[PDB]
Design a protein around this ligand. Structure first.
Ligand code: 3VN
Ligand code: MG
Lengths: 296, 296
């Protein structure tokens, strides 16, 4: 199987006067390349994929693919949908626009059954050639892809090579890798990056990496080399910022943090997302000064 | 305030060979009108709105408004989105195809804050003239509209006239009606229709109504006319079907029940929605036996 692993970033999408700041986007992706990141994930949840237009989603994949040409950094494009026909289309679009793979979230809101989740992902898997990473975040979708369904898709569809887990469920990650160790388990929960990697996970898709890509990079590569003491040390150091980045729903804190660090020009969200409270803004602003934040 | 209350049916959307069976849709809406229903809710969650085309949604609103012209049956249009710019659009569309009001679900997947939910709904309400009923289903959206947020929206925006609660939280509906008793609290949870009505709720938006519209009608009117004994009597009898209609995610069981009752032609879903298990199929078909099913 073809795979995409290592330290990966769920890219924020900066806005300037309500439009996608394309030059900011490219500069942030380059900031990622130059700080040890192995792959960038455009138009995911952290990128406010829900409120983007298809030309903006398609444009930001193109910006990512183009910025990454000439590097080992791969483009794992966000291409999920709660409608199978749209998820297949976005998989085809990313594949035809140069993405090295796709990250496909479980259908949200319409709560498909385990049988329905299998047929949904098989439809995507059979529709394109690029690797496909399952994305399970039940707290946002209303549904979970069970361990059985994840393993079945990994064994039945060749392009499906693993799953980004944001389940806060270390038991499920044992369960997953204990019955199918050839799968690529990706951490979708920054605070528990090391515990997931330590059990055989082969990478992370991080929100924290947006601000401190060097430390997320170092953590993952320390861990992949089984230097578990150094990997755990960064994990422990990162805990305060890993948590504070979820004082409010992602990506409200990270974009607040990016603005505070001067890495984006404006603190703009598309509704229903909005700037955090004044309290959390102060909490985000304080925890930051305990970390060394890289620039461009 | 202009309001839309009473017994309401979240219409299933029949498919024939992958297309919206237009006549059956109209034929099913007619079955509702002649069975005591006060309003029909097209292209909601129960209508598989997530996997519908704008051309399918638009036609089903048009079919809905046209079939209830001349009766007193209202059209409460499903018009929700996790992107405010998409939700504002659907509100205008629904107003121009003749809908008497819109049901607008809380944004799903992207988990907006209470502030974001206020600005999201304030943007919709300020965009149309027709009544706006908030829809809270945290198990499907990943988010809850707090009681404070609900009441603030009710008091600040003239068309926002209440909320359809599907939280299994009778506590919250006391909280709602005790602090804002002028609000129209609508049941979105069939099994607890009477307990919500018994505390001052003024209607239901029912799944069970698809199969037994005569009994959902009678329950709602008995309760609104303060015949609580007869209202609970139907509620208690309906429990077994009210539960089995969620043996799997709605609208999978109700479409199964509708098909088994011969009220629709094909048992077709749009993916990731799926036919139920053979086990649950026997459970839906068996519980059904016990009720007297209206025909055309
Ligand atoms: N990158 C584009 C994202 C926009 C799509 C959408 N806002 C809503 C998705 C949708 N399937 C659209 C349905 C439109 C009417 N059938 C949904 O709301 O369910 C989401 O996935 O969050
Ligand atoms: Mg090495």
């Amino acid at each position: 199987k073809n795979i995409i692993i290592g330290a990966m970033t769920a890219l924020i999408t900066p806005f300037k006067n309500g439009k996608v700041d394309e030059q900011s986007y490219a500069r942030l992706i380059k900031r990622q390349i130059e700080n040890g990141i192995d792959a960038v994930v455009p138009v995911g949840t952290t990128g406010e994929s829900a409120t983007l237009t298809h030309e903006e989603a398609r444009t930001c994949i193109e910006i990512a693919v183009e910025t990454c040409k000439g590097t080992k950094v791969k483009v794992l494009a966000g291409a999920g949908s709660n409608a199978t026909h749209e998820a297949v289309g976005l998989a085809k679009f990313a594949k035809e626009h140069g993405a090295d793979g796709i990250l496909s979230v479980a259908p949200y809101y319409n709560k498909p059954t385990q049988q329905g989740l299998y047929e949904h992902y098989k439809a995507i898997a059979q529709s394109v050639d690029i690797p496909v990473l399952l994305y399970n975040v039940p707290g946002r979708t209303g549904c979970e892809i069970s361990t059985d369904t994840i393993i079945k898709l990994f064994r039945d569809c060749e392009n499906i090579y693993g799953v980004k887990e944001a389940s806060g469920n270390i038991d499920k990650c044992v369960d997953l890798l204990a019955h199918e160790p050839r799968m690529m388990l990706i951490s979708g929960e920054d605070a528990i990056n090391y515990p997931i990697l330590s059990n055989g996970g082969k990478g992370v898709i991080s929100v924290t990496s947006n601000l401190l890509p060097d430390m997320i990079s170092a953590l993952t590569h320390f861990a992949l080399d089984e230097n578990y003491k150094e990997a755990k040390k960064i994990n422990d150091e990162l805990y305060n910022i890993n948590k504070i980045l979820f004082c409010e729903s992602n990506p409200i804190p990270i974009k607040t943090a990016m603005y505070l660090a001067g890495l984006i020009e404006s603190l703009e969200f598309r509704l229903p997302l909005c700037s955090p409270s004044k309290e959390n803004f102060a909490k985000i602003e304080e925890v930051m000064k305990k970390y060394k934040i890289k620039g461009f």
